[PDB]
Amino acid sequence: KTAHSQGIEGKAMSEEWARYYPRQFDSWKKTKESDNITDMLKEKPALVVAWAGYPFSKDYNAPRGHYYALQDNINTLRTGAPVDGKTGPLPSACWTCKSPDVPRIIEQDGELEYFTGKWAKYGDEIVNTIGCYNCHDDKSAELKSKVPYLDRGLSAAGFKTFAESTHQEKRSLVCAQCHVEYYFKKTEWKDDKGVDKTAMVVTLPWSKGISTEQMEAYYDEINFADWTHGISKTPMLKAQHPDWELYKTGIHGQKGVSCADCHMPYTQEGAVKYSDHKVGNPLDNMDKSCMNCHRESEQKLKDIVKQKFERKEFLQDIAFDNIGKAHLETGKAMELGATDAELKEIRTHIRHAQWRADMAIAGHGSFFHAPEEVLRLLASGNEEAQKARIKLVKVLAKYGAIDYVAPDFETKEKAQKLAKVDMEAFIAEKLKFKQTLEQEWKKQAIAKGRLNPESLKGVDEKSSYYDKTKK
Amino acid sequence: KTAHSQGIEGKAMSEEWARYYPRQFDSWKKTKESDNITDMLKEKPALVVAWAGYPFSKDYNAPRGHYYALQDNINTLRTGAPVDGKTGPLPSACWTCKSPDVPRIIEQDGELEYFTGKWAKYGDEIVNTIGCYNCHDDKSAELKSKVPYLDRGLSAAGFKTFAESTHQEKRSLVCAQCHVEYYFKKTEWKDDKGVDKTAMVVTLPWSKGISTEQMEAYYDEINFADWTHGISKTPMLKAQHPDWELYKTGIHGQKGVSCADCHMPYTQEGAVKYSDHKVGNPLDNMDKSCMNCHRESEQKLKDIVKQKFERKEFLQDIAFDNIGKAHLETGKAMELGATDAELKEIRTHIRHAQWRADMAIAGHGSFFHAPEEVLRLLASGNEEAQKARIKLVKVLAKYGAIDYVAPDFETKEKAQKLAKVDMEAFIAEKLKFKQTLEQEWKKQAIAKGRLNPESLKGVDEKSSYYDKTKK
Ligand code: HEM
Ligand code: HEM
Ligand code: HEM
Ligand code: HEM
Ligand code: HEM
Ligand code: HEM
Ligand code: HEM
Ligand code: HEM
Ligand code: HEM
Ligand code: HEM
Ligand SMILES: O=N[O-]
Ligand SMILES: O=N[O-]
Ligand SMILES: [Ca+2]
Ligand SMILES: [Ca+2]
Ligand SMILES: [Y+3]
Ligand SMILES: [Y+3]
Ligand SMILES: [Y+3]
Ligand SMILES: [Y+3]
Ligand SMILES: [Y+3]
């Protein structure tokens, strides 16, 4: 048994686990070191056009340390500026993969109640970032999935549930609670008090399989759309970090190498073995992350990974350039009078083109996890985009604009103008929210004993719109 | 030293080496087992349209055993039907990578003289197929490159010459004498007797590097074209089995795994080690070809290779479908009156699109040797093809044919009709040649002692146009 066999009071606060596991706590806290904010809309402005009419056209940055998950969820312009617990653009489900307070609340109020309401609903309750309780049982310390939607997805795909999986599989599934593609399913229900409510439930689109094409069929079958494109009015699908799905198709995944083998390598100290909990870039610790299976130089492997990134970049830029042009050309055709009937096939091509390309790039490590599938997906997406553009030339010609040249979107500024994103306004409103409601959330959480001030050290130094210097 | 330190009389006939190396001779001869003829124009009819106006639109089959190299060179419709040593469509250089009689003749008459004249010139001289003398010194049995153009290419690319390379490198370079991309360089010269002659010299386009793009630049710089497309009149480039070039970019190549490690695995018998000379499909001998470096199931690796093939097929069909349509749409524009000036950019896109796609598929094992580069090349080629097609819609529109639909080429028959290939005539002429001149070649070679009748057993049972049942 463990030294906490009766459970851990205050289990949602990872600091509470330090008295039993000081080593794991120490490395876990070190993700604070990965504080880099890479503004992806600045690096890849084409993404702004792709996501026109959707929150991702406002703010979208690369992933950084777990230490910053909760704060980034609060800082992103995507969550807007709530004035109370009933305002703001996004739902309560946006906290789901950012805090150990999520399972705490689910186990307390139930899954449906948790998924009901605005994101602002739990502002002073969900205040701890990715912690021990998100992956460990507080009595046995055993690995555990804390979110019901994962097993539901696994079963739907024909996979074994978490409890039925091997230990090596669990070493990857704990990550899959969050590092997967999902969609919010509007769900009507009624509580014990007999009140009718509507919940937005996190759902893994795996009922037809976990391949990009199978998920595509899943969404088309139910005529689902995350949003109607702001420029082309195409019924769009948003892919979100399908890290596990693509990893499973990659050779490492097929060979049984778990996420943990590279991201949480072991360190042998006598008869005791420790897992590095500083989840980050495995290339910063290759001797432990790779050299236990590969026998040559470090710089060599690094170069090979770099080669993969360059190939992915090459195809990514091509695909999103044509997807961007397709959206704009469709918008132009619309302005000229093109009918929905005349644009139906084109829009279907665009929807599929972007779904495939987004699925390929949304998982930032996919270019390495499943190199070949990523390149194939980008190639497939580009082909669908070009099929749309060939048809668009003809629609444009019918309306007398065969020589139309889609505007350029090579900078975030130019792209957001095309996407009609009033950044100044969104940032201004966001800052007001951070200076008022957010501070009230943190003050109340600290007063109630749900948040330890220590966990806030340097957590809010950066965002895509401000940099106090460094987190 | 060896048991033949003074050389081997009749060295060009591999049978002569059997008295010193019976084991290697026995396995070498077993490539006779790989007698399958896969008609690639039948499997991928799009290739016919791609090669319209070029010999490859007539006959092109997949590679089979070395045992059949010389006979396939004779059987292919590409070499036509010579009536004597001064007729026939192709030059003497076509024998170069098919026989050990090539180095014999080069070492005798000189490289320039060998590369001068028609293919039919050496019909009764070059009669042995890929043999010991193509890779081994007849005194030391050491590995050796017998063709001067390889070192010239290696140096031009910044590589070490064969003699300067390590043994492990030589284990791949002996294959590179033939398994590489090349072009015939028209070369004017004058023999000792003072006669002005023109030679067609095998040249490796590596002066700018061995990547597809570097070779592309090489050809564009000299305004080179293998042929003018029969349909689009585009200045085309033909890629031919760039096996070594792509292998070098693949991970196995970067890791120092030689062609021989997979295709000529070792067998340890006491203190003696033997190399399997039955060059064929490594997957038919995985325990020896792969399991000495990989630790799990055989069916597993096979499945993974199959996965790569499927991805390659997916992108290959897309790319060549758009390349085919582009050629046809250009031809249509031409019929309508489109000028060369109006079609220049389009033709440049087509040339590059096909060069990249052909380079990706011409090496039949490339999908495995360099999986990722192959997918990237097919994606790049397709993009260039689609860029051409977008521009073509506008040219067609100008001439009143915006709704033109390029004809289908889903069967070899339909494709060859579009490419205007009179197969009946070519086959009829070929058979007449085989029944007359070819037989005279073999009879004379046997009479002169250059050919051993034993080597002809079952060598001419199949071709793409006849099958006596099995070779
Ligand atoms: C499971 C052990 C697991 C792995 C592996 C993993 C990886 C991972 C990485 C490499 C990053 C980025 C690191 C960096 O320094 O850039 C990252 C980021 C986030 N993760 Fe994660 N992650 C694993 C597990 C979990 C779990 C269980 C959740 C959900 C509760 C989760 C969530 C996130 C979030 C959110 C981020 C973004 C952090 C930010 O940008 O602020 N991860 N993860
Ligand atoms: C709700 C729609 C929602 C919001 C809002 C949200 C935000 C968010 C941010 C700001 C990041 C950091 C990177 C960025 O700027 O985009 C981030 C990162 C990840 N998220 Fe998230 N997130 C929302 C919902 C969900 C859900 C429901 C899950 C889990 C199923 C999830 C998970 C993650 C993971 C993992 C990452 C890191 C990897 C990556 O590619 O970003 N998020 N999220
Ligand atoms: C939180 C700070 C936290 C603690 C504490 C903790 C402890 C812990 C222990 C004691 C082990 C076993 C010994 C070892 O170091 O291998 C262990 C192992 C793993 N953990 Fe953990 N862990 C904490 C947090 C997290 C988080 C946030 C995740 C999930 C994303 C997670 C995952 C894992 C994994 C996987 C292992 C390895 C299991 C194995 O190989 O046996 N831990 N952790
Ligand atoms: C398992 C399903 C698994 C997860 C989860 C995971 C996540 C992850 C993320 C989120 C990234 C991107 C982080 C970022 O900030 O950009 C990422 C990147 C890499 N990973 Fe990973 N990873 C999983 C599995 C594996 C496995 C099994 C290995 C090792 C074989 C591995 C390695 C890496 C590497 C390398 C990167 C790229 C780092 C870089 O070049 O910047 N991951 N992973
Ligand atoms: C560490 C982050 C790490 C790197 C880097 C790495 C690289 C690597 C490459 C480039 C390949 C080839 C496949 C591809 O094209 O991407 C490859 C293949 C295998 N690896 Fe690996 N690998 C890293 C880590 C690990 C770890 C921790 C293990 C061992 C548990 C591992 C294993 C393997 C296996 C197995 C393969 C498949 C090929 C084979 O040998 O069967 N890798 N890796
Ligand atoms: C070097 C050791 C070397 C390798 C490796 C190699 C491979 C190879 C394969 C796998 C085939 C096809 C086998 C099958 O059964 O399908 C094949 C075919 C041809 N090769 Fe080769 N080859 C190596 C070396 C050489 C050398 C030195 C030459 C040139 C003299 C050469 C040529 C050819 C030819 C021609 C064929 C086609 C045979 C036919 O289809 O009739 N190879 N090779
Ligand atoms: C000259 C233009 C020439 C001819 C003619 C020729 C023919 C030929 C045939 C018929 C095959 C079998 C496959 C098929 O039907 O296409 C074949 C195969 C290979 N060749 Fe060849 N070949 C000619 C020239 C050259 C030259 C100059 C080289 C070497 C530098 C060469 C090499 C090879 C190799 C290797 C193969 C097998 C691999 C493949 O993809 O076909 N050939 N050739
Ligand atoms: C022809 C029938 C032929 C003979 C005879 C022959 C002999 C031979 C010997 C004695 C060796 C060394 C011992 C061993 O089996 O490893 C050897 C090795 C290799 N050979 Fe060979 N060889 C014949 C033909 C060919 C041909 C046509 C090629 C080239 C395409 C070739 C290549 C090689 C290679 C490579 C080796 C391995 C060298 C090493 O690893 O030391 N041989 N051969
Ligand atoms: C080295 C430069 C090298 C050569 C030469 C070579 C040739 C070769 C050919 C011509 C093919 C296609 C044969 C056909 O008839 O289709 C082919 C196919 C495979 N090869 Fe190979 N090969 C070279 C190198 C290597 C190395 C280093 C390995 C092993 C790591 C290897 C393996 C294979 C495999 C597997 C195939 C595909 C077989 C199939 O799926 O049909 N080759 N090679
Ligand atoms: C045999 C023909 C053979 C097969 C099959 C095979 C497969 C294989 C795969 C699928 C990979 C991953 C890279 C990719 O995506 O293609 C891989 C990687 C490595 N291999 Fe291999 N391999 C075959 C043969 C051989 C032989 C004979 C050796 C050993 C000399 C070898 C070695 C390696 C190495 C090294 C890698 C790179 C990854 C790593 O472990 O560093 N393979 N192979
Ligand atoms: O924005 N987290 O999918
Ligand atoms: O047709 N041998 O390149
Ligand atoms: Ca989604
Ligand atoms: Ca060529
Ligand atoms: Y406590
Ligand atoms: Y990062
Ligand atoms: Y690969
Ligand atoms: Y003799
Ligand atoms: Y074959």
Curated annotation (Swiss-Prot), chains A, B:
Predominant subcellular localization, coarse grouping: periplasm
Binding site residues for heme c 3: 66, 175, 178-179
Cofactor note: Binds 1 Ca(2+) ion per monomer.
Keywords: Calcium, Electron transport, Heme, Iron, Metal-binding, Oxidoreductase, Periplasm, Signal, Transport
Compartments where found: Periplasm
Known catalytic reactions: 6 Fe(III)-[cytochrome c] + NH4(+) + 2 H2O = 6 Fe(II)-[cytochrome c] + nitrite + 8 H(+)
Any one Pfam family match given in the protein's UniProt record, by short name: Cytochrom_C552
Gene Ontology process terms (BP): anaerobic electron transport chain; anaerobic respiration; nitrate assimilation
Sites where the protein binds heme c 5: 252, 290, 293-294
Protein residues bound to Ca(2+): 181-182, 238, 240
Keyword Heme listed: yes
Chain sites annotated for binding heme c 2: 132, 135-136, 277
GO MF term list: calcium ion binding; heme binding; nitrite reductase (cytochrome, ammonia-forming) activity
Positions with a binding annotation for substrate: 182, 241
Residues engaged in binding heme c 4: 259, 262-263, 369
Cofactor(s) the protein needs: Ca(2+); heme c
Family per record: Belongs to the cytochrome c-552 family.
Assembly and oligomerization: Homodimer. Interacts with NrfH. May form a heterotetramer with NrfH.
Official protein name in the record: Cytochrome c-552
Organism: Wolinella succinogenes (strain ATCC 29543 / DSM 1740 / CCUG 13145 / JCM 31913 / LMG 7466 / NCTC 11488 / FDC 602W) (Vibrio succinogenes)
Gene designation per UniProt: nrfA
